[PDB]
Amino acid sequence: VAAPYDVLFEPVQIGPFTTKNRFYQVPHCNGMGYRDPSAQASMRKIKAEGGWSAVCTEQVEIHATSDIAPFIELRIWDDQDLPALKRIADAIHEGGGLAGIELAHNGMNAPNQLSRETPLGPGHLPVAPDTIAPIQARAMTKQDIDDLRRWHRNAVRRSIEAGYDIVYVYGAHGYSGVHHFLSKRYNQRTDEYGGSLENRMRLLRELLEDTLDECAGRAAVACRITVEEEIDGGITREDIEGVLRELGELPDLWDFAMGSWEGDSVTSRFAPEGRQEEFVAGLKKLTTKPVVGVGRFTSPDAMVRQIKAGILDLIGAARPSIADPFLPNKIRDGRLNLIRECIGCNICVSGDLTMSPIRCTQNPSMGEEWRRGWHPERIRAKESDARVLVVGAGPSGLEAARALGVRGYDVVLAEAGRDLGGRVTQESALPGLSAWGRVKEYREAVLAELPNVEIYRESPMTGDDIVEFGFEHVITATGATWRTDGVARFHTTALPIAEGMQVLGPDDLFAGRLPDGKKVVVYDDDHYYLGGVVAELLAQKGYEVSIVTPGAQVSSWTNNTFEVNRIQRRLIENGVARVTDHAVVAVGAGGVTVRDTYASIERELECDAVVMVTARLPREELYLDLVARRDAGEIASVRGIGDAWAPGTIAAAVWSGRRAAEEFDAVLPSNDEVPFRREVTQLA
Amino acid sequence: VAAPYDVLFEPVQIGPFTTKNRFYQVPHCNGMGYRDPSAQASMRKIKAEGGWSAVCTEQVEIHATSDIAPFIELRIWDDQDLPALKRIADAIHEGGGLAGIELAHNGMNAPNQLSRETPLGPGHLPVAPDTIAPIQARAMTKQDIDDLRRWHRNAVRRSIEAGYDIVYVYGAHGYSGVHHFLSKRYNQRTDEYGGSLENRMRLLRELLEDTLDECAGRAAVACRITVEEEIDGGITREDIEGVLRELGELPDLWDFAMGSWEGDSVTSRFAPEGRQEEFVAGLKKLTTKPVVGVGRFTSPDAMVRQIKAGILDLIGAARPSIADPFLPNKIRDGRLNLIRECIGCNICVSGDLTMSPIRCTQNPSMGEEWRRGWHPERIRAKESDARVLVVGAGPSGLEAARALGVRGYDVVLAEAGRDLGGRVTQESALPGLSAWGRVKEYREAVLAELPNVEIYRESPMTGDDIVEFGFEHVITATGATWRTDGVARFHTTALPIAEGMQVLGPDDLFAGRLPDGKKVVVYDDDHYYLGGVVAELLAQKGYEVSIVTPGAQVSSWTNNTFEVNRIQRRLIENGVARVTDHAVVAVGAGGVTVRDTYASIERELECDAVVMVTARLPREELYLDLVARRDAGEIASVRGIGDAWAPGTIAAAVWSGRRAAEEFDAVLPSNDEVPFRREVTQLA
Ligand SMILES: Cc1cc2nc3c(=O)[nH]c(=O)nc-3n(C[C@H](O)[C@H](O)[C@H](O)COP(=O)(O)O)c2cc1C
């Protein structure tokens, strides 16, 4: 490797092992935990062979008192968990990588809703944080602490038996007993485990020493540690420095992380690349040992920076690794222009928070590797001589055309408007969504290296043109329009709209049209990002803006992306009125009628204009026109794709297109069958 | 069987099969879907053994387009699911009952977050109801309806293979495609599946006929249908009546239920027993087939009335059957005083919505039958001649005593107060909570029939007493008190409280004390029921009330028990102000300072009094004392349980009490091991 990037491929000693390079995939969930272990093995194996030197598993509950149901992570309670763990460690090895396992006791943060065990913590407190479950933790005695230590030790043993190279002590994200013992916020103990740094670090020390003694140099010991909590009384700079000074010589590796998962995986919308830096700068100097840090790292020169300036030894990533499993190899090979950069959407997390195998906006193969055999980079050779027309160049069209391109097909990509990108382009122009543009960039950067793909950019297409042009196969990727009649979830049918009121939708704002008068009401019955984003826009542009939502919070689905609090603070700071728990039930000439969701009390709200952000209808005129022409015999295949088939997130659109690409000319089972593989429960 | 109740023990023909009696357990979820098949088997067998003539599984997804993850129900996608379904039906049979299977396709209610397949519905809409997933359902074509019909046919085949006696076409709760086709709220179609009632009923007709053909005298065909949806253009009395005029003679059994699950499983806090009669009356005359219905039926007289008045043929029950699997046998045998009545807490539902095996406040063995060997009625016999002291007659100590009592142990139950029941008594007295006393009545009923248990009211106990009387084995069920320092989740350490202000906790209210002046602030950081119920008590007494809570809704955890909307509604009607998204960060002499949770903005709120509803500290002074004395060789054993151990719900305390009793005198595995049996994933 050369240029300035050779720095990123130096070996690093971690205890008795050596990395091939400085790329480190840190522990991250996957929504396919104790429940889809083959799925995980396949994925982790792909990260390894993509160039990540160490590959970590998500956290792994060491004991049934660490039950965090409904969350589905990995488990190491018993020898019954071994075969699953061993497969993952095996798959990473055979992929060329060192395997990491993040042993975890969630302590006071485990509600134990499934095991029905008592949670254990430093104090008698409601289970916390990131949960409001009606259960309290019991304060641990010395005997309980000794019990915890033994469970941890058993878990480490079993990690050696499974073949892991790196075994963590986990003390990060408010999710660990160890963090709760460290933090003045949860530890108000008065015995030797509380009261002062030396004491609050006691448990940490003990778990470290125990893990070391138990490994006996057959594995390395990592410690993943909270470095900044971002709350009063929480872990600060002073604490982390004291820990490093006393214990810095103890593990084989120090992984640095935020005291909060909200804080750790913040979206691009709310944070730039490498923001963890000024919480971590200065810490390397304190330890003989190597250091990993994160910072949504996508730019290879930012990675170069982190190492030359002595902030980090390993470049850690979670999400960058999900977006592009092959990021290390693309840097290796000089093809930097082909890096699929994380968008920082958070969609990946929402899989975990909805106990689904995590989706990536950028990488449709995430969670398809085992079950459908998809690959982040490769796709089967073309099975035919076909010429395919993809109509519409939004996320779904772009990905169909990219993937069919990569297969070797002769593909013509037709686009109606001046620009490529569809909703990605219209959406990234919105406040705080600039990075989303990257979905379009990667696809263009790869399309450019495909001579077999023709792109035509000011070319609307009708069923007529397609037949006249003689196109035998079409993929119809035409998108969706935003309803203006007020229908989504609260109304399933049009609400009444007086003739005198200006009513716009997102199509109008994307087209550059803006409300006429000063006061605007945005009716948000979508509950994801767009309502809030549109309202941001209007207020920046000088309008007086109210959001009306049937939810108790604006953009309530963002609970699933950890954005919900940030969204609300951001709305309150732009002076936007949050009119939550209300539906718009009438639009009159000079205002709207809102109805409270709980008691149906109605009120008038005066305004000069109304912007509807509710739901969408597919652009399927072309498709239905072509199905008619297929039945008649004038073409051989049409397939609807993306938002024109059934509107969803951008990720779903991207996925939708890759699916069409992988399925083109495939001989398929009838749809009676499950279109993927799955593991099922082992009967006793 | 005694002469009033003998009618409930008459055989009822259900296609090819005959019930032993009229007790029918309707479909209900359990949080052990495809994940824990054996647990469910043990639970369904016990129900059959309890005298329930038909026992049904929860809804079974028939296809991967019907994926309702994160909810974890059963599946029948294909043959890999058969071993698991076959075990459930064999268990019911071994139990002596008929096995039902609720085959269901969720259509547009299926967000498909795990399958990533396109949801299917009568039109292009966002997935609904009760989900805000960013995904829309595709409008089915005739070809999609033929596909669906075929998938349902396949599932019926497989149901018969697995050995089920009754097979449902499911059209209820707004959770199936059948209901969305049937309801004008979701069906706006103009082809043969919409417009007239004849048309919207057509899918149902078609699935009914197909299911009957496929069955062919091998299984009975049940139809579970929405009789009232409780919303504007939804299904109503004229709709179901017409369905019955035309279709009444098709299925073998009609199962009548509500049009939303909020509507169907209504808490007893919000609805009396038999609430669904205003809705099913008159429908039985329109069909010759047997008819099942639910009403949270716990009163045997109420049951005799349903049958005698021609309302039902079968007494349907979900939650009453969870609270008491052995309810039919108790009535048969004439032991009506031993029935454990549902309290209408919905704590069970909370299992489904948090993807955990369901708990029941009344029945701590629900969820434990397989994994720990518990039984709702049988406890294994005493293993020694021991004499046990149980201090505290709250839920915890009552169930321990009752359980130890049934084993044959000599037991002494000492209680400090005039009353038994502890928090059950104190809390039952609160508005809407009276049914919760049934927790105590049940245990009193069984204790009355146990000469080997002795109960001392008005007997506060101390360390010296106990040792003095020469008790060897003590269970300390002493409870917890509610904190008045402001600590729970938002604060982990005390907030500042001015000397001049009156501050009350729930313990004061239970004791008879009420705030001194007219204006009251309730700080609620408990997030479950008590704050809102406390606020309702005060409004009812003439106080002017404000509830301040960091959640976006008052009682936010009641999202999990389907009361959250009802609760906000009831607070508005009582004129209680909802200061949501706020914490109390200071209590001054004539008001409080509140801090907005998002943007950190503080207002003052003036009041004459503050009632703190936050969290709890255990009353464990006695246990700590006896632990000392145990280590002096003065007693042989002590165990803290219930809220004295770690505060929780009433259900957790009951469970805790039963756990102490099942565990008594047993040889236990080290706590290193998993305290229960458990199934893991089958590696492929
Ligand atoms: C889908 C998702 C799941 C993750 N789960 C965990 C976890 O199980 N263990 C943990 O310590 N960190 C977990 N994290 C945090 C990551 O390890 C990482 O510290 C964080 O995502 C920031 O790094 P990034 O910018 O590379 O994403 C999770 C983050 C992601 C994206």
Ligand SMILES: Cc1cc2nc3c(=O)[nH]c(=O)nc-3n(C[C@H](O)[C@H](O)[C@H](O)COP(=O)(O)O)c2cc1C
């Ligand atoms: C834990 C829980 C799970 C349920 N799940 C389903 C279900 O899978 N399908 C359905 O038909 N009804 C389900 N229900 C509704 C019940 O079948 C029943 O109609 C409702 O609980 C009212 O009857 P009850 O008053 O006897 O509880 C569920 C209810 C509860 C208690």
Ligand SMILES: Nc1ncnc2c1ncn2[C@@H]1O[C@H](COP(=O)(O)OP(=O)(O)O)[C@@H](O)[C@H]1O
């Ligand atoms: N008849 C048509 N011919 C060519 N392109 C079209 C036609 N109708 C729509 N388009 C283009 O299809 C694209 C749809 O993209 P988008 O709205 O992002 O959909 P998706 O989210 O499915 O990718 C838009 O860029 C639009 O300009």
Ligand SMILES: Nc1ncnc2c1ncn2[C@@H]1O[C@H](COP(=O)(O)OP(=O)(O)O)[C@@H](O)[C@H]1O
């Ligand atoms: N020292 C004592 N001796 C006897 N009874 C006690 C003593 N301390 C507390 N109790 C009783 O124990 C009961 C605890 O009930 P409760 O608070 O409902 O706990 P749980 O929910 O665990 O049952 C109360 O009725 C209280 O009077």
Ligand code: SF4
């Ligand atoms: S889903 Fe979004 S935030 Fe997650 S890895 Fe992919 S691009 Fe990054």
Ligand code: SF4
């Ligand atoms: S949890 Fe409550 S409502 Fe449910 S079956 Fe038990 S007592 Fe009944």
